[model samples]
Each structure stands twice: as C-alpha cells, then as structure tokens.
Target: SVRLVLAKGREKSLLRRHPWVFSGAVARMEGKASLGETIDIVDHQGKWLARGAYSPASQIRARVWTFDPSESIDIAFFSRRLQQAQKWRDWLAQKDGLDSYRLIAGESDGLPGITIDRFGNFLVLQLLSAGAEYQRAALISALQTLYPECSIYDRSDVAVRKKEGMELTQGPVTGELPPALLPIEEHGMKLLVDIQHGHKTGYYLDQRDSRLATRRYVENKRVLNCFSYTGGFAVSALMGGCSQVVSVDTSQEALDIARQNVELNKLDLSKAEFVRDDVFKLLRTYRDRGEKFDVIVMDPPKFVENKSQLMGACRGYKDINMLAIQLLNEGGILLTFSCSGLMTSDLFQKIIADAAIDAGRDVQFIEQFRQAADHPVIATYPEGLYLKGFACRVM
Candidate 1:
C-alpha cells in the first residue's frame, strides 16, 4: 500500500472515527499513489496513522478506512459495512416502504466521500471522493453481495464528482433496473422515485423526518411549500390534514410531478395547488398581495457547496426566509432548511434569525431539526452532517 505522511498533527474529532484526509494535512505520499488508490496513512515521524482512499484532485485527498492495522480496504470490507448499514436501519425500524434511507454516509459510517441511498430494491451509490471512486467495483459487488435480492444503481451526477476526476454515471451496476419508477411510502405519502432520470436518488430522503414534523404542525393550516420538488412537504402536510397546501417551484415539470404526487396519495386535488414560478418572485408577490399562510415550508437546494460561497449563500437564504417571514401571519409556523455542508447548523440558525430580524417578526424556535439518524455523522469527517432546519413560530 502507498503510505501517506501528515505534515502536522490534526485533531481528529474524538466523537467518532472517520476517513477523510485533506490535502493540507499531507506531508508526503510515498510510492506515487494513484487516484482512488488505497493508501496507509502515517504521521510525520512515520507512526501508523490510518488507511484510506486517495483522491489527489480533491481537497479531501484521502479518506481513511480504519485505524486498526488489520483492517482491509477490499470488496469484503465494503460488503460487511454495507450489510451492517442496512441491518442497523432495519433494526431502528427506519423504513419507507421501498427501503428509502441513507444506506451509507461517508465519514459518518467510517467511509468518506461516498453516499448511498437505498430505494426499496434499488440502491443509489455515489463516489464523491477518491477513496470511494478508486474501488468502485468492489463497493458495488459488496453492495450486491449484501443484498442479493436488490439491484445496485449508480447516480453520481453531483458536480463534486467532477472535482475528483469522475464523470456522471447512471445505470444498474448489479441486477436489472426496476421496471417502473421506484415507489416509497414517505411520511404516509406514496411517492415514485426516478433514480435513473430523477434528482439525487430520485428523492430527497434527507427531509424525511422534517416533512413529518411539519405535518404535525400543519393542522388546519394553509401551507406554502417552496422549492417543493415532487411536493414532499406539500403531500406530507396534506396527510397531516392541512387545510390547504400550495407548492411552488420554477420548473413546470417538477410542479407537474408534484401534482401527480398529490393525486398518487389519493389526496383531494382541490386542497392542493401547484405553481410553476420562481419561488423568490412568488414570495415577493405574495408579500405584496398581503397573502399569508398558517405554515410555510422553505426547503431550497444547496445554497453553498463550499466555504468560499457561504456569505453569498447566506444572502440567498436570508432573502428567501425574510420574505417568507414577512408573508407569515401571527402564530404561523415556518419550516426552513439548508442542505449546504459548508453551512453548519449553528450558521443556518443564525441566518434564519437574521432573516426574522430583517423581516421584523418576533419568531421563536420551536425545534431544531436535522436529517434522520439513519444518515449518520462521522466525527472526523463533518461533511455528512448537512441537513438543518428550524420550526419557528411567529408571535
């Protein structure tokens, strides 16, 4: 194995073990390791460090496998991890009808730069960094071995894959693709997932719990779900018995799909509305019209992918939230979220607070929310901890 030496000591967060090696921490890489190569890491004094996957093209140069010298980075290793990941989810009763859950979260589950979402009999895997990408075949085979009943699908279309010198790939790695769109019962709504041609793994499973929590707060409420891709929040609110749920997005296609979801759940079509318009403009228009909702859901796409864009991203976040807050009536509840890994929960809360202040609304946070525990957070690798939201009540 190629050996990597750290330039200086890094405080590996002691909460849990992880496998991400940033380029800045590397003092040397012995034997010219290739991308996605498994390498043994060491300290400057040649002390045994850890094992990981190497990705020279990314800032996270390598993702460690284990601190134990005996740990292997092979098909069997991934097989065991994949099997256990699924088992734990089952043990926790984390089900969405069609196995819609975080099958693997890099760093959180001792692997870094990889993400896998299992949709029923189908698995959507992505190698976002060198370590996972280097041994793609092994990862797939291990996943296949773990679930002989399931098929493995690749949906590594995320832009970050390009930084690792990987191209977007979509197909069944093992077994055959599902004959029809994948279906999952999420928060009591049966939704179809299109992994082959749909957004990340065909659905945003990360919002699984938040959508339900918002449902609990949506009793008899008029809901406005912005960025309502496929209408997860809208449908969930309908299930919660919200008086009305109107979904808004710029994509006519997504809005149309949202409409289908509304009908798929046998929900009363009259209780739901789909608007194909820019969410920002719609919010402004609503504010001008003195329109208000009993509850508002703002689940936007990632505003900042990296730290460099955090400030600008906060501007976008604040603008949307401030407008939403401005359009809220007294006692309204706001469910807002940011999926930017660069934006920590603390930062996200601060942004929301700033938005409330800007909108001059007296809002109190009712709950601090996050992605389900099925999407674990690796201590040393903090990248997996992204989803964040607040249930705020306007006074």
Candidate 2:
C-alpha cells in the first residue's frame, strides 16, 4: 500500500477513529496512490495510524477503512463489514416489524460512503465515496452471498459520486430488474418502491420509525403532510384514522405514486387529498385562508449541504415551522424534521422554539424523533445523527 503521511498534529481525528481525513491535514505522500487505492496512513513521526482509500478530487482526501495498521484492505475485509452490518439490521427487521430499512449507514457502520437500503427482496446501494466505489463488486458479492435470493440494485448516481471522481451509475447489479415496481411493508402499510427512479434509494428508510410514530397522533385528526414525497407519513396518518390527510409536494409523479400507495393499502381515497405544488407557498396559502389542522407533518428534504448554508437552512426550517405552528388547532400535534447533517439537534430545537415564539403558540415537546434503529449513530460521529425532529403538542 502507498504511504500517506499526515502533517504534525493532524492525526488527532484519525486517533479518535473519526474516519475522514481532509486534504489540508496531509503533509506529504510517499508513493503514488490513485483515486480509490488503499494507502497506509502515517503520522508526521512516521508511525502507522490507519488504512484508507485515497480520493484526489475530494476535500476529504481519504476515508479510513480500518484504524488497525495490521489489517489488510481487501475483499475479505468488506465481507466481514457487510456481515456485521446485516447482522445489526436483522434484529431491527424483526423488532420493528419492518421489511424495509437501511442495511448500511456509511461511516457509522464503519464503512464510509456506502449506503444500502433493503426494500423487501431488492437492495438499493449508493457508493458515494471513492473507497466504496472501488470495491463495488466485492460489496455486491458479499451482499448477495448473505441473501442468495435478493436482487442488488445500484443508485450511486448522486452528486457526491461525481465529487469523488466517479461516473454516475444506477441499475441492477445482480438479478434482472423487476418487471414492476417493488412493494414493501412498513408498519402494516404496503408501499411501492421505485429504486431506478425514486428519491434516495426509492424511499427514505431512515424515517421508518418516525412514520410509525406519526400514526399514534393522527387518530380522528385532520392532517397536513408537507413535502409528502410518496406519502409515507400521510399513509400512516390515514391508517391512524385521521379524518383527512392532505399531502402537498411539487412532484406530480410522486403525488401520483402516493395516490397509488393509498390505493395499495385499500385506504379510502375520499379521506386523502393530493396537491401538486410548492410546500412553502401552500403553507402560506393555508394560513391566509384561516385553515387549521389537528395534525401537521413537515419532512422537508435536506436544506443544508454544508456549514456555509446552515444559517439559510435554519431560516427555511424556522419559516415552515412558524407557518405550521400558526395553522395548528388547539392541542394539535406538529411533526417537523431536518435531515441536514450540518443542522445540530440543539440548533434545530432552538429554531423550533423561535418559530413557536413568533407564532404565539405554547408548544411542548412530547417526544424527540430520530432516524430508525437500522441507521445507528456512532458515539464519536455526531454526523451520523442527521435526521432529527420532535412531536410537539400546542397547548
């Protein structure tokens, strides 16, 4: 392996096993390591630290695969990682009664830039980092070996793949593509998954527990599900016996799929409303018309990609929560979330508090929300705990 030497005092993060090594931390490299090549990491004193995969084009110059200098980076290493990851989820699969959940959670699972979501018999993978990109075949083989009947599908077409000096690619990596869209059960609701064309591996499996929790608050209540996507929350609200669920999103196709999901579950179409429009504008319109709901859900997409955009992202989060707070009936429930890794939990709670103050509402947090158990958060890596929210009750 090539030798990657870090500058003085730059091995602190690696010593803590944080997984990422930025470009500015490197002092010099001893040998030529192509992108995705395994390299032996060393401190300024020439002592071994870890083994990592090099990515010349990214600001994250390398992602450590193992902190043990004695360990070799090879197919067997990935196979072991894959087995442990799958074993972690096997418990969650039965515990949560979920057939669909995140199987691999990137760095949190000790494998950087590799996210895999299992949708029933289908597995959707995102190889976002150079390290995972280089070992795609080995990862796929390990996954199939674990489940001989499972079909492996690739969804590494994200922008991060391009940033890692990789071509965007997606499709079936194992069995032939399914003749029709795949369907999976979550909390007893059946939903269709389109891995080839849907958002982030067909669905947001990270929100699995949150969706189920939403069901508890929707009984006989009017619901407004903002940025509903394929309507996971909306369906849950309906299953909770909500009087009505109005799903709002800009994508006509997603709304169409959501309508199908409603039908797939044999839900009453009359109780569900699909609106194709920008969620922010619709929220304003609802507030202007003196509209109110007993339950409101705001699961917006990630707004802050980096630290530079965090302030702006908070404004967006605050605006939506403010609108939702004002549009909530007395004793109504508000379910809001921020998927931005840059948005810390404390800051998110602060933003919601500010929004509640602006809306002149006394809100109490009934329960804090997070990603499903399958997406475990490493104690040292707070970035793994990105999806955060709360079930707030306006009293």
Candidate 3:
C-alpha cells in the first residue's frame, strides 16, 4: 500500500486526532496512489500515524479514516461508524422528541467528507470529498442495513465536490424518488422541505434550535425575518404570538415555500407577510421610512467561502447589523447569525459591537446561540463549529 510521509515536525495535528492533512505538510509519497485510495500515513521518521483516503486535487491532501492501526476501511468499518452515530441521534431524538435531525456530521461523527441529514423517513446524503465518493456504495449499503424502512437520496450537487476533482451529481440512491416537497416536524412545528432542489439537504437542520429559540423573544412584537428562507423564523415568530412578521428573501421560490409553510402550520395569515427582494435594499428602505421593529432575525448564507474574503465578509456583516440596529425599537431583540466557518465567534462579536457603537445604540448580549446538538464538534476539529449567533438586546 502507498504511504504518505509528513514533513518533519508536521505530524502534531494527526497525533492529536485531527483528520485533515494539508498538501503543504507532505514531505513525500512512498508509492503511486489513486484518488480516494486508502493508504497509511507516517511521519518523516517512518513512525506509523494513521489510515486515510488520498485526494491529490484538493488542498486537504488526505482525510484520516481511522486512528487505530487495527481498524480496517471496509463495509464493516462503515457499519460500525454509522451505528455509533445513529446511537447518539437516537438518544437525542428521544430526549428532544425530534422527528428529523442530522444523522452524521462529517469528521465529528468519525466519517470525514460525508454528511447525512434525516428528514422523517428519508435520508439525504452529501458526499463532498473524494474519500466519500469512492466509498459511496459502502456507505449506502451500511445505511440501508441500519435504516431498512427509510429511503436514501443523494444531494452531492454542491461546488465543494469540484475541489475533489469530481462533477456534481444528485438523485435517488436507493428506494423510490422523494416528492418535490417533503414534510418534516421539529419540536411539533411542521415544515415542508424541498429536498430535491432546496438548500443543503433540503432544510437547514443546523438551525433547529435557533429557530425554536426565536419563539421566546417575539411575543406580541413586530418581527423582520431577513433572508427568511422557507420562513422558518417567520413561522416561529407567528407561533410565538408575534403581532406581525415581514419575511424577506431574494428568491421568489423560497418566499413561495415560506408562505406555504405558514399555511401548513395553520398560522394566522393576516399577521404574516412574505416579501421577495434583496434584504440589504429592503433594510435600507425600512431605515429610510423610519420604520422600527421589535425583533429582527438575520440568518444570511455563508458570506466567506475562504479566508481571502474574510475582511470583505466582515464589512458585509457589520453593515447589515448596523442597519438592523438602527431600525430597532428600544429594548428590541436582534437575533443575528453568521454561517461562515472562516468567521470566528470572537470576530463576529467584535463586528456586532462595532455596529452597535456606530449606530449609537447600547447593546447587551442576552444569550448565545450555535448549531443544534446533532451537529457535534470534535475537540480536534474546531472548523466543525461554523454557525455562530447572538441574541442581542438593543436599548
């Protein structure tokens, strides 16, 4: 088998159980390797380190499959990993009474480059890396064995697959094709998911807790749900007894679904408004009209894909936050979030603070928010913790 030897003093992360091996850390390859081939990893001194899948085209040269030398990368191995991940989700489902959740969270679940989200009776798989693509059949087979009653589908159509030297593809892997819209329930809230063409496995399961948390702050208040994809926050606000909610999004399709979601929940239609427009432009219009709201939710998409754009993304975040802060009523609640993995929580907090200062509003952080419990972050992989949020009170 081929072996990857790390450069001198470059094996610290692997020794600490981190999964990724960047191309810059490689000293030499002992033999020819195919894409996604399982190989041994070692230090310059010829000390065995771990087993991983190789990806020549990506900056992440290798993603470790197992730290134990005794472990093999086979169907049995995948079954064991899937079983362990399912056990955790089982506990979470029972404790929280959840009908849908993230079943596997990539490296955090000991399976790098692969993510799986369970929505009711369907499992949506995202094979984002060469390693996951190579083991597609095995992964599906394991999942089929574990979930005999559930259907399996693939949503590997994201741009990240190109980094692994793969083309985008998605369809039903096993079982009948899913409908155009699939229904899911979270904390007794009904939501329709577009698994076929919707964002990220058809729903943002990561924001499960955050959406529920919005209910606590919107009682009898006016809310502005910015970037309100599928009206998750809008529905939550209406459910929480908000006087009125304006849901804004750039996609008319998303707004249509958001409106459908409110109807699905039998929410008060008169109290909900769905607007299709640029969030920034709409916020500016509200500012110009001197309109104020008691609550504002800004859950925008990932603004920074890589580190090179972090500064510009920070500027974007600060600008929108400042606008929202300026348009808030006294003692208003601002539930803001940044999903960019490149943006750290410290940096996000600093940006919000600067925005409040520039807006001349005194802000106090009443609560902190993050991705739900199903999206576990391993100690060695800090990048897994991407979603950062704050519940700020503007006084």
Candidate 4:
C-alpha cells in the first residue's frame, strides 16, 4: 500500500479525527498510488496514523476513511458503517414517521464525499470525492443490501468532481425508478421532487425544519420568498395561512417546479405569485416601490466557495439583507440563511446586524436555525456544517 507521510505537526487534525489531509501537509510520499487508491497515512517519523484515499489532483490530498490502522476499507466496512447510520436515523424516524430524509451526510455519516438522501421510496446518491468515486460499487451494494425496496439514483454531476480530475455523470444506479415525480410530505405539505434533474437530489431536504419554522411567522401576512428554489418557503408560508406570497428566483424552471409543488399540495394559487428575475433586482424594485412584506425569506446559494472570495461574499450577503430589511414592515420577520461553510456563524450574524444598522431598523433576535436534524454536522468536521440561518423581527 502507498504510504502518505505527513509533514511534522501535520497529524494534528488526523489525531482529532478530522477527515481531510491537504497537499501542504504532506512531507513525502513512499509508493506509487493511483487516484482514490486506499493508502496508509503516517507522520513524518513514519508512524501509522490513518488510512484514506489518495487524490493527487486536488488540494484535499487525502480523505480519511478510517483512523484505526487494523480496520480494512472494503465492502464489509462500508456495510457496517451504513447499518449504523440507518439505525441512528431509525431512532429519529420514530419521532414523526419521517420517511424522506438525508440517509448519508458525506463525512458526517462516516463516509467522506458520499451523500445519499432518501425521498420516499427512492434514494439519490452523490459521489463527490475521488475516494468515494472509487468505492461507488461498494457503497451502492451496501445501500441495496439494506434498502432493497428503494431505487437508487445518482446525482454525481457536480462541479466538485472536476477538481478530482473526474468527468461528471448521473443516472439510475439500481432498481426500477418511477416514471413520475415523487411526493414528499413535510409539515403537512406535499412537495413533488424531481430526482432526475432537480437540484441537490431534487429537493432541499436540509431546510425542511427551517421551512416549518418560517411558517409560524407568516399567518395572515404577506411574504416575500427570495431565492425561492422550488418555493419551499413560499409553500410553507401559504400552508401557514399567509394572505399572499410573492416567490422570486432566477430560474423559470425552478419556479415552475415550485408551482407544481403548490398544486401537489392542493394549495390555492390565488394568493401565490411567481416572479422570474434576479433576487437582488427584485428586492431593490420592491424597496423602491415601498412595498413591504410581513415575512421575508432569503435563502441564497453558496456565495463563497473558498476563503479568497469571503470578502466579496460578505458584501453580497450584506447587500441583499439590507434590501430585505428595508422592505420589511414594522414587526416583520426575516428568515435569512447562508449556505456557505466559509462564513462562520459569528461572521454571518455580524453581517446581518450590520445590515440592520444600515437599514436603520432595530432588529429583535427571534431564533437561530441550522440544517435540519437529518443533516447532522460532525463535531470534528466543521466543514459539514455549511447551512446557518437567523430569524429576526425588524421593529
């Protein structure tokens, strides 16, 4: 096996069980290894540390699969990991009979770069890292053994694959997929998920509880849902008896899906409006028109992919939040979210506070939100906690 010898002091993160080993941490390499090959990792002195997949083409040089030197990285190991994850979630599922949820949250679930979400009877999988890509067969076999009734689909065509020198691809992995969209219920609202071509496994399941929380503030009030991908927030607001909801997004295709979700729930469209435009422009126009909403939801896409772009991302977040706050009615609620892992909670909250100050609106803290329970953040791997949200009332 190839041995990845880390520079002195570079084994700190691995000792703490953090999965990633960057290129800068390696001091020397002892054997020829192909991409995603199982390799042993050690300190500068050649002491055993962990075992992981080696990726030379990416900055993340290695992704640890197991810390124990004796444990083999094979189908049985993955099956054990998969079974444990299922049992852990099984305990949670009994709370509310939740059938649709994140079955595997990549490294958080002990399987780095492999994410699998369950939507009703179907499963959508993502193989992002070269390590996970190499073990695709084993992962799928493990899932099939545990969930023989459900069909497995692949959504591995994301940009992250390019960094690993892999081409994008997606399709059915196992079982016969259904012909039509599948309906997943959340907080009593049925949403149609297009697992074939929709974003992130055809749904934003991470925001399930967040949407339900937003519903609490929109009763009999007007709502503005910005970056309303497939209208998750808009639908929840309508479900909460909102007087009207104006949903805005850049993709007309997404808006169409949002409309279908509303119809799937049999919610009345008389009070719903879909606008295809840039969210920034829409918010600016609404502010200029003096149009105010009682509830505003801002769930933008990840603005910062790396630390280099954090400054610009902060500015972008502050800009939209300022506009949203300016367009908020007195005693209105704002559900703002940041899916950028680079943006810390302190930084995000600070940006919102600055926006409130610039908008000249005194904001009252309401609630703090994170990704739903199913998307558990690994305590050691903070990068997995990408979604953070703040709910505030503008007074």
- lDDT (Cα, tens digit) per residue for candidate 1, span 1-395: 68888775552421135556677778887888888888888777777767777888888787667777898888888887777777777864445433478778876776677789877778788877767777888887776677788888888888888888778666778778765465687545687777888887778887788977987988888999999876778778888899999899888877877778778889888999988888889899999999999999988875633544444454788888999899789999998887776578898889888998889888999898888877877556566677888999999
Tens-place lDDT digits, model 2, residues 254-365: 8988898899999988999999998889999999999999999988876733444444554878888999999998899999998776567888899999999999988999
Using lDDT as the measure, name the better of candidate 2 and candidate 3: 3
Show the colliding residue pairs in model 1.
Answer: 19-63, 19-64, 36-134, 51-65, 98-120, 107-111, 108-378
Better of 1 and 4 by TM-score: 4
TM-score per prediction, in order, is 0.93, 0.94, 0.96, 0.94
Per-candidate clashes, comma-separated: 7, 0, 0, 0
lDDT of 3 by residue, 144-241 (tens): 89899999999999888998999999989888788888888887788989888889899999998899999999999999999998778989999999
TM-score for predicted model 4 compared with the true structure: 0.94
All candidates: CA RMSD (Å): 2.3, 1.9, 1.5, 2.0
| Model 4 steric clash pairs | none
Assess the local accuracy of residue 119 in candidate 2 as a C-alpha lDDT between 0 and 100.
90
| lDDT at 96, model 1 | 46
Candidate 4 residue runs with Cα over 4 Å from true position: 178-180, 304-314
Candidates by lDDT, descending order? 3, 4, 2, 1
